Design an enzyme around this catalytic site. Structure first.
Site, PDB file in Angstrom:
ATOM      1  N   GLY A  19      50.215 -64.235   7.018  1.00  0.00           N
ATOM      2  CA  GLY A  19      49.885 -62.863   7.378  1.00  0.00           C
ATOM      3  C   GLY A  19      48.403 -62.305   7.496  1.00  0.00           C
ATOM      4  O   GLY A  19      47.311 -63.075   6.864  1.00  0.00           O
ATOM      5  N   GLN A  20      48.050 -61.340   8.463  1.00  0.00           N
ATOM      6  CA  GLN A  20      46.940 -61.037   8.516  1.00  0.00           C
ATOM      7  C   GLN A  20      46.426 -59.747   7.821  1.00  0.00           C
ATOM      8  O   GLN A  20      47.625 -59.376   7.052  1.00  0.00           O
ATOM      9  CB  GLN A  20      46.871 -60.340  10.072  1.00  0.00           C
ATOM     10  CG  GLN A  20      46.464 -61.795  11.320  1.00  0.00           C
ATOM     11  CD  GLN A  20      45.556 -62.702  10.817  1.00  0.00           C
ATOM     12  OE1 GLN A  20      45.941 -63.845  10.752  1.00  0.00           O
ATOM     13  NE2 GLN A  20      44.204 -62.326  10.610  1.00  0.00           N
ATOM     14  N   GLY A  21      45.358 -59.240   7.718  1.00  0.00           N
ATOM     15  CA  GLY A  21      44.904 -57.933   6.972  1.00  0.00           C
ATOM     16  C   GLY A  21      43.431 -57.769   6.794  1.00  0.00           C
ATOM     17  O   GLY A  21      42.523 -58.455   7.324  1.00  0.00           O
ATOM     18  N   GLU A  25      43.179 -64.207   5.574  1.00  0.00           N
ATOM     19  CA  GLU A  25      43.631 -65.595   5.669  1.00  0.00           C
ATOM     20  C   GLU A  25      44.663 -66.069   4.311  1.00  0.00           C
ATOM     21  O   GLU A  25      44.111 -66.349   3.335  1.00  0.00           O
ATOM     22  CB  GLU A  25      42.677 -66.678   5.647  1.00  0.00           C
ATOM     23  CG  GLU A  25      42.657 -68.035   6.299  1.00  0.00           C
ATOM     24  CD  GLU A  25      41.712 -68.950   6.333  1.00  0.00           C
ATOM     25  OE1 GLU A  25      40.427 -68.919   5.328  1.00  0.00           O
ATOM     26  OE2 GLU A  25      41.352 -69.485   7.387  1.00  0.00           O
ATOM     27  N   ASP A  91      52.374 -67.420  -6.812  1.00  0.00           N
ATOM     28  CA  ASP A  91      53.907 -68.007  -6.839  1.00  0.00           C
ATOM     29  C   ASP A  91      54.590 -67.218  -5.493  1.00  0.00           C
ATOM     30  O   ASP A  91      54.148 -65.788  -5.377  1.00  0.00           O
ATOM     31  CB  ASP A  91      54.793 -67.319  -7.986  1.00  0.00           C
ATOM     32  CG  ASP A  91      54.651 -68.303  -9.275  1.00  0.00           C
ATOM     33  OD1 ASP A  91      54.768 -69.416  -9.182  1.00  0.00           O
ATOM     34  OD2 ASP A  91      54.754 -67.804 -10.255  1.00  0.00           O
ATOM     35  N   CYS A  93      56.664 -65.591  -2.361  1.00  0.00           N
ATOM     36  CA  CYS A  93      57.597 -64.495  -2.258  1.00  0.00           C
ATOM     37  C   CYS A  93      57.972 -64.801  -0.659  1.00  0.00           C
ATOM     38  O   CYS A  93      57.313 -64.294   0.322  1.00  0.00           O
ATOM     39  CB  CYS A  93      57.146 -63.199  -2.422  1.00  0.00           C
ATOM     40  SG  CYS A  93      56.425 -63.095  -4.277  1.00  0.00           S
ATOM     41  N   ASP A 136      46.378 -48.902  -3.038  1.00  0.00           N
ATOM     42  CA  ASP A 136      46.794 -49.456  -1.594  1.00  0.00           C
ATOM     43  C   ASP A 136      48.343 -49.590  -1.469  1.00  0.00           C
ATOM     44  O   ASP A 136      48.732 -50.636  -1.106  1.00  0.00           O
ATOM     45  CB  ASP A 136      45.984 -50.518  -1.438  1.00  0.00           C
ATOM     46  CG  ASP A 136      45.907 -50.996   0.142  1.00  0.00           C
ATOM     47  OD1 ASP A 136      45.550 -50.038   0.691  1.00  0.00           O
ATOM     48  OD2 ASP A 136      46.427 -52.083   0.655  1.00  0.00           O
ATOM     49  N   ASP A 154      48.629 -57.320  -3.157  1.00  0.00           N
ATOM     50  CA  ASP A 154      47.398 -56.960  -2.772  1.00  0.00           C
ATOM     51  C   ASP A 154      46.597 -56.201  -3.792  1.00  0.00           C
ATOM     52  O   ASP A 154      46.483 -55.073  -3.276  1.00  0.00           O
ATOM     53  CB  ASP A 154      47.255 -56.767  -1.001  1.00  0.00           C
ATOM     54  CG  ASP A 154      46.003 -56.880  -0.418  1.00  0.00           C
ATOM     55  OD1 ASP A 154      45.087 -57.932  -0.921  1.00  0.00           O
ATOM     56  OD2 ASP A 154      45.695 -56.088   0.344  1.00  0.00           O
TER      57      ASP A 154
HETATM   58  C1  LCI Z   1      48.105 -60.279   0.799  1.00  0.00           C
HETATM   59  N1  LCI Z   1      49.031 -61.193   0.114  1.00  0.00           N
HETATM   60  N2  LCI Z   1      48.457 -61.725  -1.134  1.00  0.00           N
HETATM   61  C2  LCI Z   1      49.401 -62.490  -1.472  1.00  0.00           C
HETATM   62  C3  LCI Z   1      50.545 -62.589  -0.839  1.00  0.00           C
HETATM   63  C4  LCI Z   1      51.872 -63.504  -0.906  1.00  0.00           C
HETATM   64  N3  LCI Z   1      52.685 -63.587   0.179  1.00  0.00           N
HETATM   65  C5  LCI Z   1      53.835 -64.414   0.063  1.00  0.00           C
HETATM   66  N4  LCI Z   1      54.911 -64.371   1.023  1.00  0.00           N
HETATM   67  C6  LCI Z   1      54.772 -63.496   2.141  1.00  0.00           C
HETATM   68  C7  LCI Z   1      55.386 -64.323   3.386  1.00  0.00           C
HETATM   69  C8  LCI Z   1      55.240 -63.600   4.644  1.00  0.00           C
HETATM   70  C9  LCI Z   1      55.709 -62.185   4.590  1.00  0.00           C
HETATM   71  N5  LCI Z   1      55.349 -61.493   5.766  1.00  0.00           N
HETATM   72  C10 LCI Z   1      54.842 -61.384   3.458  1.00  0.00           C
HETATM   73  C11 LCI Z   1      55.178 -62.151   2.083  1.00  0.00           C
HETATM   74  N6  LCI Z   1      54.162 -64.827  -1.248  1.00  0.00           N
HETATM   75  C12 LCI Z   1      53.401 -64.742  -2.360  1.00  0.00           C
HETATM   76  C13 LCI Z   1      52.304 -64.079  -2.141  1.00  0.00           C
HETATM   77  F1  LCI Z   1      51.244 -63.851  -3.035  1.00  0.00           F
HETATM   78  C14 LCI Z   1      50.133 -61.851   0.392  1.00  0.00           C
HETATM   79  C15 LCI Z   1      51.066 -61.743   1.553  1.00  0.00           C
HETATM   80  C16 LCI Z   1      50.270 -61.846   2.802  1.00  0.00           C
HETATM   81  C17 LCI Z   1      50.987 -62.741   3.648  1.00  0.00           C
HETATM   82  C18 LCI Z   1      50.782 -61.236   4.210  1.00  0.00           C
END
Ligand code: LCI
Lengths: 310, 252
Positions: A19-21, A25, A91, A93, A136, A154
């Site tokens: 994911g971006q944001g 990274e 961990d 998700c 946020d 986040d």
């Molecule tokens: C910003 N941030 N910080 C920790 C995590 C984060 N993201 C995931 N899984 C992502 C899989 C792709 C999905 N589109 C979003 C959840 N698992 C644990 C995390 F700490 C994230 C999500 C980043 C991937 C956007």
């Protein structure tokens, strides 16, 4: 240079960018021995002339404090050689809420939707009880595991908050579409209710499958809340008078509260409509708190909350 | 993890500095001098005692992993304080901390040119040494101090300005002078400080009407055997520290 309590991030093998944001990274990764899946987030360092980012120290201090079923787990922090970078390890998700809502093929029952909000509001109970504002809230920051456990994410813009003299916190916070009317009228003395406004937006999104107030400019946003929630009078919002932006900024007068009318045709249920009405209150003082929301007849009526397989 | 940063006496004996070849007594001087430098610097930067105490604890924990031979206290202390300032929400600017740390360490010397290679070096040296503290500490930066548990006792056991404030002084000096921070948990140390402060003022907190002592309301692990042993230890090093007891001494 010996270093026991900060492992090299090579113990996790990388997989893919996920994911971006603002963060930028975030990778998925696999523990090289156990196969545990994690998420690695690099500590951003775009020309930092004051050593380790103080924002990072704040985020790290918070993730270490907050440990709870409905808040994302920081496992550890990792490094990568001298001659220098730092990664946060979480961990893993599987999904986020915006990804599942924006998928037309995933579908939620009324019982399934309850259990989402029960986990989200309990997570917000936990963090506000721990003297932390997320600041946020949006769908993208609501992660759900493989099992179906919701997890808040986040904490980049998060901070601690005090009981008190009048507070003086940062105003440029929350994604525009989920920002409360406090902040869009310049409020620097806010607290827990700003995140509950975001939850109300997220609730509605569970049925509409798309953010409900997509304002382009900040005036657009504020005139668009005026549309849904009715106008910002001092009868509905006692002592809104004493905001500075209240006078100068344009503000639609003849505007009734049309929040349950406009959401009828997505959310059928009468309790869910009533809960979203009490989360999208203009006045933060009359807006429903974390604890009262979980007590609301939405979460205690038929059909009750159920686990998340669909 | 709860006993990661707390150690036995034998663990403190065979430390990283002992391994390189630094006498046990000599290994207290570099600890007390760092505390002494953090205090000097912090006073000048206008950070609170809290921030200094956080920095002292980082320093104390830092040298349980690293050696003074490898890392001089005069290099570390500006970094450990720089970090403590940011953690505790009183951030001081890098150039300001360097600049201050210089005039403490080199009172007569004027500063290098900020355009020079020697200044641009010693700036990068502080930034690098901050990252080396972080990784040594495992990013465990939230420190609890004995000073929080002082008020839990002194206000609720009801004793004057003179007793209340004396007990802080002891806690502040327990970070400067001892390695209690690395042995007994903050609420235990707070009891040692009040016990000593009562002996120094001829104060006698009574036996509560249960058949109970004051310390059991602060931490149920504590015994008198322990307080008498540790108040003895802390009072010795305060007598050895010149002019420190004169601050709390009664002239009438
Ligand atoms: C910003 N941030 N910080 C920790 C995590 C984060 N993201 C995931 N899984 C992502 C899989 C792709 C999905 N589109 C979003 C959840 N698992 C644990 C995390 F700490 C994230 C999500 C980043 C991937 C956007």
């Amino acid at each position: 240079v010996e270093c026991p309590f900060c492992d090299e991030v090579s113990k996790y093998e990388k997989l893919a960018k996920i994911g971006q944001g603002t963060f930028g990274e975030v990778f998925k990764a696999r523990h090289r021995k156990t196969g545990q899946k994690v998420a690695l987030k690099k500590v951003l360092m775009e020309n930092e002339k004051e050593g380790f980012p103080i924002t990072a120290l704040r985020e790290i201090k918070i993730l270490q404090l907050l440990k709870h079923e409905n808040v994302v787990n920081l496992i550890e922090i990792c490094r990568t050689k001298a001659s220098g970078s730092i990664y946060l390890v979480f961990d893993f998700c599987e999904h986020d809420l915006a990804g599942l809502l924006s998928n037309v093929l995933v579908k939620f029952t009324l019982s399934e939707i309850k259990r989402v909000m029960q986990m989200l509001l309990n997570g917000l109970y936990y963090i506000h009880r721990n003297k932390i504002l997320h600041r946020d809230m949006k769908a993208a920051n609501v992660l759900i595991t493989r099992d179906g456990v919701l997890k808040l994410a986040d904490f980049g813009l998060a901070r601690a908050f005090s009981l008190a003299q009048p507070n003086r916190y940062t105003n440029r916070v929350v994604t525009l579409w989920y920002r409360p009317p406090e902040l869009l009228l310049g409020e620097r003395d806010y607290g827990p209710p700003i995140d509950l406004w975001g939850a109300g937006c997220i609730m509605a999104e569970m049925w509409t499958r798309s953010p409900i107030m997509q304002g382009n400019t900040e005036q657009h946003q504020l005139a668009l809340i005026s549309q849904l929630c009715g106008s910002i009078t001092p009868e509905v919002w006692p002592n809104v008078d004493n905001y500075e932006l209240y006078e100068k900024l344009e503000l639609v007068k003849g505007q009734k509260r049309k929040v349950k009318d406009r959401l009828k045709a997505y959310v059928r249920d009468p309790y869910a409509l009533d809960l979203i009405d009490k989360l999208l209150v203009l006045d933060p003082a009359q807006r429903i708190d974390s604890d009262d929301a979980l007590n609301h007849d939405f979460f205690w009526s038929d059909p009750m909350p159920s686990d998340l397989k669909g | 993890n709860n006993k990661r940063w707390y150690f036995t006496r034998e663990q403190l004996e065979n430390s990283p500095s002992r391994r390189f070849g630094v006498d046990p007594d000599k290994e207290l001087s570099y600890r007390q001098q760092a505390a002494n430098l953090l205090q000097d610097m912090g006073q000048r930067l206008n950070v609170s005692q809290l921030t200094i105490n956080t920095a002292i604890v980082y320093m104390h924990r830092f040298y349980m992993i690293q050696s003074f031979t490898r890392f001089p206290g005069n290099s570390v202390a500006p970094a450990a304080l720089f970090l403590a300032a940011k953690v505790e929400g009183q951030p001081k600017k890098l150039e300001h901390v360097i600049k201050v740390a210089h005039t403490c360490l080199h009172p007569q010397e004027s500063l290098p040119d900020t355009r020079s290679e020697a200044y641009l070096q010693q700036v990068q040296d502080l930034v690098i040494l901050e990252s080396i503290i972080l990784q040594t500490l495992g990013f465990e930066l939230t420190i609890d101090h004995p000073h929080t548990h002082v008020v839990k006792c002194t206000q609720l056991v009801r004793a004057s300005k003179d007793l209340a404030q004396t007990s802080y002084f002891m806690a502040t000096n327990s970070l400067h002078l001892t390695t209690f921070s690395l042995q007994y948990t903050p609420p235990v140390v707070a009891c040692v400080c009040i016990h000593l402060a009562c002996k120094w003022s001829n104060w006698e907190i009574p036996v509560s009407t249960d058949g109970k002592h004051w310390w059991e309301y602060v931490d149920a692990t504590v015994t008198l055997e322990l307080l008498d042993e540790l108040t003895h230890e802390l009072l010795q090093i305060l007598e050895k520290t010149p002019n420190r007891l004169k601050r709390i001494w009664n002239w009438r």
